[PDB]
Ligand binder design. Structure first.
Ligand SMILES: *[C@@H]1O[C@H](CO)[C@@H](O[C@@H]2O[C@H](CO)[C@@H](O)[C@H](O)[C@H]2NC(C)=O)[C@H](O)[C@H]1NC(C)=O
Ligand SMILES: *[C@@H]1O[C@H](CO)[C@@H](O[C@@H]2O[C@H](CO)[C@@H](O)[C@H](O)[C@H]2NC(C)=O)[C@H](O)[C@H]1NC(C)=O
Ligand code: 10T
Ligand code: 10T
Ligand code: NAG
Ligand code: NAG
Ligand code: NAG
Ligand code: NAG
Lengths: 727, 727
């Protein structure tokens, strides 16, 4: 009879089995068994082996990822993985012919390649190297040289810079092929005047002098990257003339000032859609641009432009959403907030100024997952009115009121969080279920939506978790000015409502965040509840997502206000329930959570004994322009400087005398710079408040190193245990 | 009923009075009584007015410092002080005609000036601005520019670079006037190929992007600054034809490569002495150079050369000793290591190389303080064979056996640590007594060694310390391996040795250090004994100074060995004394003391429960060449690399699992770089040992900001109380 220990969490004793497959046709997907990678047939299942691992063991180098070509002829191996930022990395690449049975040696892909992608059909390659774009019409051929202007830290061709990577595209890649892989669309970013963030990287103890890393990084109000857009034709590449890309200029109302490229989506072989966002991110335009054969140019007609804007806030959850065109390319679906401020699927005609909505209600559509000619498939939180649940729906295109829930009723107790993966023409789908019970992976046919087999139900984990004393998750709401607000609690085993438990408040609370859901987790909180008998709770107040614009846009231009006040009020609500020890309530968070934590601790509320802030923001002038300005506008006297000034944690320094505070930050944090914490510490020293700090040499925003990760949770555990007088 | 508290220490409740005087001649001096400046006399006794704050009230700026021309016709005012390194700073200056107290309005000295000085007689002015040397013959006349090669962070004319400032000269100036003010000697430094240490500077929270500070700084082994030495004739300075500076080169045996200028000392109006130290600091040379009148040149004869070398260690305490010259210039005295390790005064004939010792015995002369044609005055630790005492000895130059202690018998019980300040021809002298009693300042006639008067006796401070329960101070020795090793103890008031006290070991242990002496102090240790009833102890083990080369050279090429061992053995010996709590012994230290504390905590000896390291060295390769190499040699396969690698705190990480460790470091430490501590924390993370940490944003090696100084000492108090379970 024993608990889920810290060493359990940290060491990964109770492992969570996944089921990762890559569709490659309408009928088949690839998946790993004994490392020997196989292929399954969705119809019956004569799942014969595809690529035995007695192939690449004494190939010479460590395999990291691979990529099968669409036509199925060439596996693209990947080694020398060297991570950059959250998405970016560099690596070495070699190709392996299946039909010739061997690996290619001439016209090899350079070391230090920045990104690689196959065409969507066939086997063409496109790769970025040294900031320039290259294309290989055949793997064994010499590449064609698409761009000549790439320059380390200044001109990026076909890859994003820091801020486009982290904030706009969530990808290092910036190449998009057309469907039949004829045209290659790419973006080029210019960082010329984007000031640099500089910081030290101490490296191995063998490095005598520290290295100063320098990254183009626009802090709020700074000069932003500019952006241009190009399309080249890959079927007519010459070796005796430089291939000439065609520029598609942003629409007029974008060129009038600073703007971003926020979406690229091909609709047909000869039609592409670009979405642009103004720097003041409440106005955005979609351009449909058609290819003209008799000139070789692209034409975005004025009348095909669609405008999406917001008077209450910004546009989209984080950016405008992506269109989903019909086969013929004359219409699209995309999620937009309606008149009521709730996000729903709207159906657009290229020619018309106005769309008709095909979903509605006090819930939101999370995403469009597949569009056939008979049915639209989407994910929502409609079921049981739980904004923290996810389910698969299909809309009958011939009568959109006829909607079906595919996943709702499959396993009601076990499963209320779902995501889907469709076959190439959506004839089959894999259903992934992430809680409340053990995760569950299942396969299904689109014909009857009949369940075919269980892929992975984590019975392995179940069978050995039975004799661990597990905490229960409770998920509920409280009320506030006639509005529902949701929370979750990880409750210790044998929870007794007549005992006063100490309480940790797990906060993130950034705009569109959601901490109160039905996902099952084995994390630090599990340890605190299982081992230490600490109620760890999380709460979604104002600014939180997936419940409508009224709640989401409540912190518009006013960060460090309602989302902070609301965490404090949540605590008062939790004391008022009488199973909480008033004398032992704490708060912690990472990233935006670190900022809210810090603001709550400096609030003078008196509700919180102590807290921990990991890589927090300290004032918004220190964070990147694209995120920050979305919610804060510009930091100038003409826009929002006053509130930038009023929302710093530094200005609350004196009130840290009222709490025990632990501040942790990594030194190699490229994202929220160590600066932010340096300024916190300095302000606390200046008003004479005592507190604890911990820096993590060379660690980044996730402090993800194995040893660093273990060290930090061990440090926070000790701090909380001593904060709560735990033995 | 009350004790000396942490606030008493931080807010300076009980101040030590000083009698800081400066001699203007051989009869009179100055003193800051009130804050108005007064002239004083010792001749007939009287003392009149001279200056005040309202002489320079409507001035505007607050005066940081002043300086009278030797003749007393001019006063130089120092304001706009901006500190740089340990001695270097920049400032703005104004000159008054001290006769008329009116400012010299035109041809003013430039802002941002890096050093300024009067000639030894008359009123000549030499200053350095933008790394170039300037001379003002009459304060209202235009300057003459001496050098034209000054370039920031690259060529330094008349001022030191980082390492010459910290380690060689302990000064910013590299300018030296001749006794009558005709010649201005100076040094030029070239840091062209010297690598930069780089680190972030965060500044006020207004600074959106942190600043990167770049300092030329040779770590152990790196390329060093080169040097040149010049003299220029400040009388024949024209106005139409650039000044020509005569170069005195280093002797041959130095130019074989990599050497330093470590002493510059004039002998007459036309004779100057230079001392050069090979980069391997066990071989030094002295060159004596005569000005050739029918040439304008300086000639240094090979016969006149003398050589200071050491077969068992380096030469000097931290540098070759300075020479004091008899009036004719044909004779000089300088302290060197005698035949059997002890440091004593040697008498030199300029022409021949066989010197002869005027003192001997198992004690050391600390410094030669005054020279007349009659006697020679010096300070030493002979009295009662106490390494940690200082007294003033006078030796008869005609008969070396007839020596007299001028300070020994004055106040035996109160006063065992003297320093002296002579008048410009040694007819009068001040005695500073720094302990063991309350400091006492007394003026004497040297002509008959009669005590004239008590200047300051600290009877004010004596008065209030009777209302306070003050700690006692024990100074004694222990015999280890038939050798006397000295220690000091700060013992709680009402100390009773049938109790078991917790004991903090206060450590520095650096080469030639002394933490065991007769000096009275009011510091953190005073509070710990007085209030927290903690014994604070220090111990001078192998490597400490002022007890003979045997003891001091004991760790040559062997940092992190015997000085680490001996601190551990000190604790054992203290616990074996029977009034220490074995379960509660802590260790702490700053800078080199930080390094030792850490090595001791890493040693696995099990004696220490916990410890604090502040700005420690973590491995010797990171620290500056001049200091490190002297003790370690080069970190190369053919010299002493093995020991460099054997003596890092990183390698001892595993052993910190036995102790509570607090590691503190300022992020703007130009001296001991944050790196060193970043490598400590990373090592400890990587083996998985928990520890406390604290950075100080923008503090240097001193962590000397008012607020930070308060913050750190408060933080360290909490750590020690808690480690000791003090309530
Ligand atoms: C990247 O953008 C910069 C502007 O920030 C461009 O640099 C300018 O180039 C024009 C050429 O007409 C010059 O007149 C300017 O002097 C340049 N400005 C600066 C500040 O350098 C540059 O054209 C862009 N680079 C590319 C290849 O698109
Ligand atoms: C400082 O020293 C550097 C060498 O470390 C000197 O630089 C050289 O100067 C010569 C003569 O002008 C050049 O031809 C070399 O190419 C330079 N080498 C390097 C590495 O820069 C410099 O001249 C010195 N300055 C002074 C005033 O002494
Ligand atoms: C101050 C701060 C710092 C980081 C983030 C963040 C962002 C945005 N940079 C994004 C990209 C979004 C597109 C999801 N992801 C994550 C996981 C995080 C996060 O680690 O929380 C948000 C705020
Ligand atoms: C690792 C380290 C760091 C600094 C020092 C130091 C030195 C030498 N740089 C000197 C210059 C000497 C002439 C005394 N002074 C002092 C006060 C200190 C010190 O702060 O203790 C010695 C070792
Ligand atoms: C890449 O690196 C490997 C090993 O360093 C080398 O053999 C290969 O030729 C390189 N390829 C290219 C094209 O740079
Ligand atoms: C393509 O353009 C680059 C840069 O303008 C030029 O140097 C090169 O000659 C061109 N390539 C060929 C082979 O035509
Ligand atoms: C020093 O600088 C200030 C401010 O720029 C200026 O007004 C003053 O005249 C300067 N003084 C000298 C000595 O040049
Ligand atoms: C002195 O020499 C410098 C630098 O070599 C030169 O620029 C200048 O012309 C000379 N100055 C005068 C005042 O003659």
């Amino acid at each position: 009879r024993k608990t889920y220990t810290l060493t359990d969490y940290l060491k990964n004793t109770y492992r969570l089995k996944l089921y990762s497959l890559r569709w490659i046709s309408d009928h088949e997907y690839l998946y790993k068994q004994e490392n020997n990678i196989l292929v399954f047939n969705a119809e019956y299942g004569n799942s014969s082996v595809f690529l035995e691992n007695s192939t690449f063991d004494e190939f010479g180098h460590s395999i990291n990822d691979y990529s099968i070509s669409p036509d199925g002829q060439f596996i693209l191996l990947e080694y020398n993985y060297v991570k950059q930022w959250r998405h970016s990395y560099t690596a070495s690449y070699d190709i392996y012919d299946l039909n010739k049975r061997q690996l290619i040696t001439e016209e090899r892909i350079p070391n230090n390649t920045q990104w690689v992608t196959w065409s969507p059909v066939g086997h063409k390659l496109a790769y970025v190297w040294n900031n320039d774009i290259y294309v290989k019409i055949e793997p064994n051929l010499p590449s064609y040289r698409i761009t000549w202007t790439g320059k380390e830290d200044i001109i990026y061709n076909g890859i994003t810079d820091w801020v486009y990577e982290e904030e706009v595209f969530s990808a290092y890649s910036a190449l998009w092929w057309s469907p039949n892989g004829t045209f290659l669309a790419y973006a080029q970013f210019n960082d010329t005047e984007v000031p640099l963030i500089e910081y030290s990287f101490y490296s191995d103890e063998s490095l005598q002098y520290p290295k100063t890393v320098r990254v183009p990084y626009p802090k709020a109000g700074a000069v932003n990257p500019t952006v241009k857009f190009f399309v080249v034709n890959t079927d007519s590449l010459s070796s005796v003339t430089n291939a000439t890309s065609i520029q598609i200029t942003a629409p007029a109302s974008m060129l009038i000032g600073d703007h971003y490229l926020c979406d690229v989506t091909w609709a047909t072989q000869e039609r592409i859609s670009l979405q642009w966002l103004r720097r003041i991110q409440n106005y955005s335009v979609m351009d449909i641009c058609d290819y003209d054969e008799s000139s070789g140019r692209w034409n975005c007609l004025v009348a095909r432009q669609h405008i999406e804007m917001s008077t209450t806030g910004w546009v989209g959850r984080f950016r405008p959403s992506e269109p989903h065109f019909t086969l013929d390319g004359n219409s699209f679906y995309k999620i937009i907030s309606n008149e009521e401020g709730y996000r729903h699927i709207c159906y657009f005609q290229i020619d018309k100024k106005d769309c008709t909505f095909i979903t509605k209600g006090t819930w939101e559509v999370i995403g469009i997952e597949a569009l056939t000619s008979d049915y639209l498939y989407y994910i929502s939180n409609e079921y049981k009115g739980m904004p923290g649940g996810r389910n698969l729906y299909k809309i009958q295109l011939s009568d959109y009121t006829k909607v079906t829930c595919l996943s709702c009723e499959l396993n009601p107790e076990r499963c209320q969080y779902y995501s889907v993966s469709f076959s190439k023409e959506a004839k089959y789908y894999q259903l992934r279920c992430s809680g409340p019970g053990l995760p569950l992976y299942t396969l299904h046919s689109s014909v009857n939506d009949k369940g075919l087999r269980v892929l992975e139900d984590n019975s392995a984990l179940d069978k050995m978790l039975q004799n661990v004393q597990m905490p229960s998750k409770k998920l509920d709401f409280i009320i506030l000015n006639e509005t529902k607000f949701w929370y979750q609690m990880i409750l210790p085993p044998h929870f007794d409502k007549s005992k006063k438990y100490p309480l940790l408040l797990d906060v993130y609370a950034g705009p569109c965040s959601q901490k109160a859901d039905t996902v099952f987790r084995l994390n630090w909180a599990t340890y605190l509840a299982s081992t230490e008998n600490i109620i760890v709770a999380s709460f979604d107040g104002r600014g939180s997502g997936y419940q409508g614009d009224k709640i989401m846009h409540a912190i518009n231009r006013r960060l460090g206000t309602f989302e902070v006040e609301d965490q404090i009020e949540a605590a008062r609500q939790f004391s008022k329930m009488g199973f909480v020890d008033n004398k032992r309530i704490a708060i912690w968070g990472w990233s935006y959570g670190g900022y809210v934590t810090s603001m709550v601790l400096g609030s003078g509320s008196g509700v919180f004994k102590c807290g921990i802030a990991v890589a927090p923001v300290s004032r918004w002038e220190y964070y990147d322009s694209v995120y920050t300005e979305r919610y804060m506008g510009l930091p100038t006297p003409e826009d929002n400087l006053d509130h930038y000034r009023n929302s710093t944690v530094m200005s609350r320094a004196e009130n840290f005398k009222q709490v025990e505070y632990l501040l942790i930050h990594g030194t190699a944090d490229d994202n929220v710079h160590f600066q932010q914490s340096a300024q916190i510490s300095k302000a606390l020293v200046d008003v004479g408040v005592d507190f604890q700090a911990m820096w993590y040499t060379d660690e980044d925003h996730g402090i993800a190193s194995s040893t660093a990760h273990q060290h930090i949770y061990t440090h926070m555990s000790h701090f909380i245990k001593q904060c709560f007088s735990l033995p």
